[PDB]
Amino acid sequence: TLLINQPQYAWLKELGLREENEGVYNGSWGGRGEVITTYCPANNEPIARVRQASVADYEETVKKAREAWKIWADIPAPKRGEIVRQIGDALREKIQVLGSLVSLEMGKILVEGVGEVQEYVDICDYAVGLSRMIGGPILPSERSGHALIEQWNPVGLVGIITAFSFPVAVYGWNNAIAMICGNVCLWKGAPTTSLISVAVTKIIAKVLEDNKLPGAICSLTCGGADIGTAMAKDERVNLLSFTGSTQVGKQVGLMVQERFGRSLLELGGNNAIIAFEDADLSLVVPSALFAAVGTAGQRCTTARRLFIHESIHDEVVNRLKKAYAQIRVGNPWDPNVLYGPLHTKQAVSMFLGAVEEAKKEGGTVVYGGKVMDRPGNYVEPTIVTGLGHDASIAHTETFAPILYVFKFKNEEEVFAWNNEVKQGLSSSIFTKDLGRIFRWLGPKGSDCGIVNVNIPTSGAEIGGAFGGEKHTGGGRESGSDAWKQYMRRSTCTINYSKDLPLAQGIKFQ
Amino acid sequence: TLLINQPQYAWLKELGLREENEGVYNGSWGGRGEVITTYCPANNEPIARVRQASVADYEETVKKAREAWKIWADIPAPKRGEIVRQIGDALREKIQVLGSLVSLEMGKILVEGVGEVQEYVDICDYAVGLSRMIGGPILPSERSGHALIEQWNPVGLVGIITAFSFPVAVYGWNNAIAMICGNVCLWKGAPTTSLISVAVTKIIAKVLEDNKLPGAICSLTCGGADIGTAMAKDERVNLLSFTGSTQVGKQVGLMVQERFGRSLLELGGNNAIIAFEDADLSLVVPSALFAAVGTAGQRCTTARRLFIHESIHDEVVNRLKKAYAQIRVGNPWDPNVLYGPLHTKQAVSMFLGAVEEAKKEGGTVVYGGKVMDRPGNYVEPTIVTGLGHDASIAHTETFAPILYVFKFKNEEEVFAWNNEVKQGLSSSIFTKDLGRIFRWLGPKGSDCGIVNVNIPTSGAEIGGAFGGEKHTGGGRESGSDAWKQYMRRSTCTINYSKDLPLAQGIKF
């Protein structure tokens, strides 16, 4: 009855998965907490089991991680980079089966699950180079015979809490950067993607163990909100990177602030696409379709608001409706499938409530709006017109494929409407107007962390910093100098002279 | 008689080498030039043969590379980085056989041959990350409604001329960086390491082929000075990276300057180690030995001058002599061996000439000084005392294991004596004094491009920029922002408004 016992899913064993798997790793494998069975969202079948972390498991793992840090922080960064290079290699070796497991346990289509593993492989390669670059400037001191240098050192233990929607890549972004920065990591993933968490940890553990490194450098404590809360409260967790709901993220931030820890918060998005009258509609329509229905609308960066200039609103909505009707629904691992299930039955519940609420607030469902009558957690990708831009439901993040469509007339008002929500993750305008594009990018433009032109709100690349503003939580991951969040800056003044001149020319004698 | 036809050298075939090899690669393999045989400097046996480039080969190769550039410069930098990543992997998979070829044809010991291939693997890994990073700042314009962007673009065709002593890694540094910067490469290596050049190019070519890219992205034209001079004079070679002797590099520099090209010169070194009275002698002696005799004294970063404080001069000399006597000499592929042959008989002759000139200028050979009596190009690593720091022979760079030892008393003079030569590549002090170390690193310290403390003059790592000042030519390779030498900067102002406000507030 478990999928992992059926011959058609024996590829799962290529990841080292079994009927029941240890969900704690700290150099040894265990798990004395509750046993969780995870399910395939496309057919509601159970896949396999994971023994989760008890509180005693959490405690011992934190200690072993902090013991491992003493060794790992002593290893020169480029040598830590080499470890991350081997992790990249080990992921490349398993990218198809790992991508398939993402499609199976999480529910996104296979090209997206493989693509998610590729994001991790890519950030690994990026971090290898970074391991020879991280640091700060040597600055010219105003004092004769003094050196002034900005040093960067690891913060220590980086707790990483991740959500279901990207059960591989988010951890990967955090882990590759944290590792080359000399931190140890402790991962608590979404309970409903526990096999993914275990399978990834199995890959990393083999690299660490083959290199005779303490496995706790990349520790795993599978569990629920109780483990996550313990991490938020744990003085030994020097940085807590939390990707998840804004509501939970706000509590995580408060807990970490209460103990003067560091948090990196990657929270909700309410991402708008804006199509101006001069837009290339052959870009707008497919970009909106992918941004809205990709991952069944379950990305932090999913397009949730579509603003269309009055002149082209009806045409775009009609073209969008014709495109939605061609979406190929099915099992996310099957060929030519573009659209799979939502991740849980609760997600279907939230989808239905949001559709209901949209109607109660005056919206019209012009496409979709229903649960699909078929095995699994399938819903129709949904388009809603007629709501005011400030309708409560439109300002709410519903992690589901509902696209709220609005009319607008002029640039100033629609930029303001993009910015009026509490979320601040991604945003996109479709236009040919040069000045408009640079205004969008400027101080009176989009207030989001990702500000795009003529592309969807989703699908960032790893070379830039990824994250948002306002209720999205302010953290950044991946590229640019995001690595600085995983390290502590020191400003270091070295007097190598025989005199003591004081800053600002102060004479104290 | 060819070693590649003998059974114990069949491993050469794992690099795709055969009895006669094509020395031109531009996407297809060819070579209408003179056939050169290369020889093993440990025993003077012929290894295999390479058909070098004719000038018609050179001409067709340049044209193919520049057409390949139009494809390659359109490929996003991160995707170019992916190609270089795969070159790293293919080198990694051949590191043993390639290192062995370096030991066979060039003559350095096996651990340095492997280590040199590792340097190329390392710069590949570094360039992959750089390929997602290269670029310039977006700057705040003083003008409303204007953007100000610093852009970087490939220069086009990068010619790479390399020397015998690092016949893999030098090309590797230039190749990895030039590629992610969007350039195509044309390589002319040392004729006496032609097999190494072909073997590296075979590895790269397979990667380009497997990725459906034109092979001319990494072109090879094996040949001698006539080819190198053609590259220096060729307006189609946008950047010429030249690693070699100061004497040739100066003419390369002038030829490139005459046509308003770009040159990256990596030239000779006359590198000093300075041991102060407070130095840890247990660090000094091993460091000086490896720095002087590593690669049989044939690195541009080799220690050629050793300054020792009067108080410890005699002790350090005596300890260096006893350590030299323990140097293990033999064939460079035998695993126990620390010291192999010089690369050529001409290197033996230049060494002999330098030793006798040191004697004629008043120096004393306290260790070595003689050629050895075994097959190959072996000479004794040599220590000369008693010369003045400005002895004519001590200011010359002889590419051979001769270490000139001098006394000093004061920090100011020995810093000056470090700086007094024409070269300016590497330098090193051994001391525990905190103030002395930062003075060494400061404006009144070493004038060199590499300024080390308590490590020898050789053996840098890829994270930093590599190169020298003064007659070493000023080029930098590998790390930091050396990549900018392979790209052209543009300062770009975009007026996206309906107004034309003038810089500096000029009302015209």
Ligand SMILES: N[C@@H](CCCC(=O)O)C(=O)O
């Ligand atoms: N320049 C001062 C700044 C102190 C600031 C403070 O006391 O709040 C210092 O470095 O001591």
